[PDB]
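User: Please run a holo structure prediction.
Assistant: Happy to. Please share the sequence and the ligand.
User: Here you go; the ligand is zinc ion.
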Amino acid sequence: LEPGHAADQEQAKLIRSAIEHTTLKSVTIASEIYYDPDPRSTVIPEDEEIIQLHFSLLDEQQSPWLLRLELDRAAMNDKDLTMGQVGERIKQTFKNDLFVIWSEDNDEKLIIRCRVVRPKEAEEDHMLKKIENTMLENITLRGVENIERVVMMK
Amino acid sequence: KGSRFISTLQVKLYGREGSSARTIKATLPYIKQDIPIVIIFRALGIIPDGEILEHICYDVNDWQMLEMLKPCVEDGFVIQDRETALDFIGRRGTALGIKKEKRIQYAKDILQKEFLPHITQLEGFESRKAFFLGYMINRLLLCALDRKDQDDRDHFGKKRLDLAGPLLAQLFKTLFKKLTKDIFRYMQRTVEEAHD
Amino acid sequence: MDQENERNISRLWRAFRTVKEMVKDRGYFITQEEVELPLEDFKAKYCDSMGRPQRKMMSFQANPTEESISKFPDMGSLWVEFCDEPSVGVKTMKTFVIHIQEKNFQTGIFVYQNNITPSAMKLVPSIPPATIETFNEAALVVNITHHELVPKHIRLSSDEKRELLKRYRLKESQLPRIQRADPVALYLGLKRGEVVKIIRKSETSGRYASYRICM
Amino acid sequence: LPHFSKDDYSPESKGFVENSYLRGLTPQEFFFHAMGGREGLIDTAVKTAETGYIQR
Amino acid sequence: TTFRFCRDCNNMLYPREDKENNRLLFECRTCSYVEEAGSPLVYRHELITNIGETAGVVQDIGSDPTLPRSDRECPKCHSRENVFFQSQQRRKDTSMVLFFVCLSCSHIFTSDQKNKRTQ
Amino acid sequence: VHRNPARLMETLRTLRRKGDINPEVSMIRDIREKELKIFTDAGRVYRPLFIVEDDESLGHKELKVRKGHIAKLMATEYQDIEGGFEDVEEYTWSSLLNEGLVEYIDAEEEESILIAMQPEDLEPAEANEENDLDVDPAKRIRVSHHATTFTHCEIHPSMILGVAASIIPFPDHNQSPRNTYQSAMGKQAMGVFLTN
Amino acid sequence: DGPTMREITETIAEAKKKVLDVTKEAQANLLTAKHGMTLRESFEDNVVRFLNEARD
DNA sequence: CTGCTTATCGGTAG
DNA sequence: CTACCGATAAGCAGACGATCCTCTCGAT
RNA sequence: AUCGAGAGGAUG
Ligand SMILES: [Zn+2]
Ligand SMILES: [Zn+2]
């Protein structure tokens, strides 16, 4: 640690969680594809209001195929993470070529929804799989590559 | 009781965890490259998808198993027929075009002898070797999903001891056949002579 | 992201500092007042009317200390420039060389932010007598000589070196050697032949001195 | 060993010799201490050929 | 997931979008057959999987001698007869929970006091 | 495949224990994998041992060989000592192997059984003893039987040893590598190597 | 000593019991994993130390 | 449980 | 919006493997 | 006498 600090553990904890490598992969229960056509009205009953507050009518497309992402309420406690910070590092990756929604930490079910966008060989589907692939092993959330389990020894 | 024909077969699983598309192939005796499994089954006697999967997966409930096999099928839509299911298994020579109907009869007996020489080695057996080749696959995957352990190599029940008997055997057998072809080579040199 | 606009600037500030420490360490002239410039006074003075950090506004020449001439009548004129442009092709290379070529300097340091295209590295050493050097921001946020396992190195002169070669009766080859691309040897900027001297500490005899020739 | 049930991570099952050299080992204990001591002879047999190549 | 097969030919089915009325159709690249979809669910990966944990359970398990026998009770019947074992799913990061098998009745229960379970 | 190996297994094991199916040949029922492997290969290593069975009527779960069997076994080894003038001679080892009291177990089949260690102290009843008064302070501490659904039982543990090793007095009071040394030296000691 | 021999076996018995609880715990999923290692890794490390400290 | 060779990937110039 | 160069990631191959000592046996 | 194999001794 910096000479300015010494036995301030709270300092060290920060540094721990600013260094340790964390991939989207390490926080994923299950990835899945769906045919959701009506953008405003989703076919899934688990996501009523998301989807109910987003407040997209402040401006104010489209995309056919959807890709869901269940997250583990478990590793949102150990590694320091919020839904938002996740979503942002996602969009920040592709840029302005895919819509991305999500819920709040307060909710019981943590979820992500994504939809390709928007050029102008159909077969649009196979590739969408190589986005959910790139999405897992290649997406950094916080910290430096090559680093793994980081220990707080005195 | 058929000498010592050590004809070794391996079923491999290409690509690592999280790779693009993990395809399954196999090593066959007297053949250059590896061969997608779906081609092997068609080259046996089973043609349609979904019937192929019934030799491999046994419980049509547990999907992940099934979802493992999409890559293979989608690799075999190029060969759908009995006949040329063995056309792909014909890279033995550099365009043995002279054998368009003979390379098949080269492949046809290769799955009589070199492919699982136990079980049987006669003609009228194909569903015997399919259920097995399709049981190696149930194992190779029943492990890649991590539902059962890898196989231990230093287990004492999976090794034998070549005693004085069978030692002499694999010797005497080799001796006798040497002397047997010392007779032939002597006979071609009679009549020729009488002889006696 | 309003913090990633706040760290990007802070990292640029330590890199700025480290460039200073190096320039004076080659033998040039900078006050310890100019280096220890707090984060305040830098938040403005080097940005625009909103808070975006202007690099072209940092560039500066450099003159040697009156003591450096006594040992090097050659060292005289150094110039540093920073750059806003991430990707730098053969087009950006044309601009900087022409700057010095006419100004009649000798040393050109160019600090970029991301990386250089091989179409630009091709036209680097082909314009003597002067010479140009290059460094990644990310490799200058921290000064490397400011680290334990690193001892201090001291470039010694030509008429000087001949003295080592006579008083240990060596041949050029016979010295130990240091790498051109070597972190330190870049921090000072060596040459084909220039010899260092190294004053490391020792559990055997307090101070021990090793010498290295360059490759 | 086939003298145990499956899924048993207790001391005695996984090779802790309670008894001392004086009181005497028990059958399983004996056999475990066997697997152990063996590792000694194994190393000195085949590891030295490295510790001696290093020296050279 | 559960994907499906065609009749007649009998191969695999590959998805397709209905351009006009917006719906989902499967079909084989052999004959032509095309059936409508059931659930929107087309693909599923799972990285952390709750199944595989409890395999090989039969009606002939309360006979194997190599399996340990505890003093639990079945929350349905009440027989202190049962056999048990850890997660058959031989992964590295798995849990050490027990899975017991009611013998007088035939039921399956666990020692995990936390974490909800659906079997 | 077979449906209902409940009875099919038991019928196989009944005929070998009579001697009808060669006592060499081994038979491995797998509950939790739904498999049944029968082996006849040459080279498998095997050993004794005793049999146990709750098939006993008014006496819980017990060993098969009773004290009466032991008597007919020494009334043979003494019979051919003094009055050996042909007085109706019989009852050897192989007599046991046929009356079904010993089973030749190989390593693979060793996976499905729960062997006891000490015949007597491994199924008598409760007391219990452990921490209960009183015992001999100077004797050793034994695991204790805690699982009771045994099937077999070991002959005598000293039998884990080899020819050179069984020369060592109290090998269970020595540090292991030592007993290995004596094994190599016992073969380099000196004496009578043959009476001739 | 007879008084000592007793005390030794009783200093193995409260350390073979301190292991039964660390199993009894881990088996009802209450055993929290140390940052950066498996749940089975922190059980293993745990027990092994419980038995070494027991001998010394 | 490797330094060296063979192969397919992006960069600026005809 | 295409061929020529060049520079790197990817994949088959190598040449090593303790010291000294005593004996016996079979061979062109 | 030369080539080839195997066993043993000292560091455990
Ligand atoms: Zn069809
Ligand atoms: Zn019950």
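The beta strands of chain F are 26-30, 35-39, 46-47, 50-53, 62-63, 105-106, 152-153.
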